[PDB]
């Protein structure tokens, strides 16, 4: 089988300036003068996005900012002024020699100014209290860099083993992150305590910024 | 315009066998190819086989054994068949339209997520994540379902800028949980009507959450 190398295997670019992706192959991928590598975008939970066919030809719809070069064993994809949304995996693509083939994929991300987290705070519902589990989730909305701590409070009591954190992709507009924390309790531990808080530790904060409730509600 | 949709069981247990159909428009089947490509989650992507636009096929041969590509050109759908399934077959499944003389993949279904798994299927709960007190955050918990994926829109699409939908976690229950949010001006959380359009499509459910103010 035709194996692909891409490099870098990451890459973290300025608004506006040049992005470059290598594939290589271990065999030509080359016939009758044409090559038959191929260029894919693939933002999450989105299917690969054709860029560049035949090592060069730049497909309908796609900007003139992508453009592709090589030949045989060596071929190159240019994004000469990258904008926020072309954050995404890129992949190579051979359709040369059976069976078709891709390349292990570039993640390209923005550099961009630090920006603070806006942190959120929300109780579980009554709705779920119900059920017997109580979901307490912390949000942290539109941050850079990715690097942030969540910490969860309950009685000033520091929490360790019972919450799970999940962050988005750089965001297509303003190229921040997102991160979701859920503190999980069982009603009957839920109903021991009273003040709940979750304290966001950031680059863009100058000292960790804390949310909080009380289990009285209003 | 060149479509592709992928329908798939969401569930397969393993040994048993997948069985996926992709069903195309604004292009006929006899002119044009169309492969299948998997990509397990965070991993890159595999070829399967190719339904040639004559209606001969090509398999990726570590799956010659096991792997069986049909189509019915009048019926715009072409089928896979992938028997003794392990955990190694967990993907998303995509079907892509073909150029037949270039091998190029020009055109990719949305793609279907195949879980093999000797568990359950289980529906989601749906709880609000409700506004307190300029910028205001309010959203949906979707708990203790399997398999993966579970989609989110709001307003039926109307609301888009400011959502985030964050990636699914694996609880220690073994059951999937996953929050969606949207930031929104805080003088509209009164009068502006708020809704997460939740599906699952393993359990062929939809919910409809609410969301307002306590
Ligand atoms: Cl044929
Ligand atoms: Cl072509």
């Known amino acids: 089988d035709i194996v692909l190398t891409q490099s870098p295997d990451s890459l973290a670019v300025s608004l506006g300036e040049r992005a470059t992706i290598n594939c290589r192959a271990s065999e030509s991928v080359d016939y009758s003068g044409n090559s038959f590598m191929h260029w894919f975008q693939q933002k999450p939970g989105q299917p690969p996005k054709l860029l560049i066919y035949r090592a060069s030809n730049l497909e309908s719809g796609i900007p003139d900012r992508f453009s592709g070069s090589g030949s045989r064993t060596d071929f190159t994809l240019t994004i000469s002024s990258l904008q926020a949304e072309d954050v995404a995996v890129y992949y190579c693509?051979?359709?040369?020699?059976?069976?078709?083939?891709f390349g292990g994929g570039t993640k390209v991300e923005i550099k961009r100014t630090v920006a603070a987290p806006s942190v959120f705070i929300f109780p579980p519902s009554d709705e779920q209290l119900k059920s017997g589990t109580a979901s307490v989730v912390c949000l942290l909305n539109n941050f850079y860099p990715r690097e942030a701590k969540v910490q969860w409070k309950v009685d000033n009591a520091l929490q360790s083993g019972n919450s799970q954190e999940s962050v988005t992709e750089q965001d297509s507009k303003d190229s921040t992150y997102s991160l979701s924390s859920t503190l999980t309790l069982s009603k009957a531990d839920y109903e021991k305590h009273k003040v709940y808080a979750c304290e966001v530790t950031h680059q863009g904060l100058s000292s960790p910024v804390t949310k909080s409730f009380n289990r009285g509600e209003c | 315009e060149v479509q592709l949709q992928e329908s798939g069981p969401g569930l397969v247990k393993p040994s048993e066998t997948l069985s996926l159909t992709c069903t195309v428009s604004?292009?006929?089947?006899?002119?044009?190819?169309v492969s299948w490509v998997r990509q397990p989650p965070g991993k890159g992507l595999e070829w399967l086989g190719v339904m040639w636009a004559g209606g001969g096929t090509n398999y990726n041969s570590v799956f010659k054994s096991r792997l069986t590509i049909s189509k019915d050109n009048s019926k715009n759908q072409v089928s896979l068949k992938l028997s003794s399934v392990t955990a190694a077959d967990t993907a998303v499944y995509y079907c892509?339209?073909?150029?037949?003389?270039?091998?190029?993949?020009?055109?990719w279904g949305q793609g279907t997520l195949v879980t093999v798994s000797s568990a359950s299927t289980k529906g989601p709960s749906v709880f609000p994540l409700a506004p307190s007190s300029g910028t205001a955050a309010l959203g949906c918990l979707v708990k203790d379902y399997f398999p993966e994926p579970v989609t989110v829109s709001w307003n039926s699409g109307a609301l888009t800028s400011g959502v985030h939908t964050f990636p699914a976690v694996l609880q220690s229950s073994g059951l999937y949980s996953l929050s969606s949010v949207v930031t929104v001006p805080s003088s509209s959380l009164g009068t502006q009507t708020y809704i997460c359009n939740v599906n699952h499509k393993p359990s062929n459910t939809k919910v409809d959450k609410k969301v307002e103010p306590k």
């Open positions: 604004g292009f006929s089947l006899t002119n044009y190819a």
């Open positions: 892509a339209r073909e150029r037949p003389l270039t091998g190029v993949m020009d055109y």
């Open positions: 693509h051979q359709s040369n020699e059976d069976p078709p083939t």
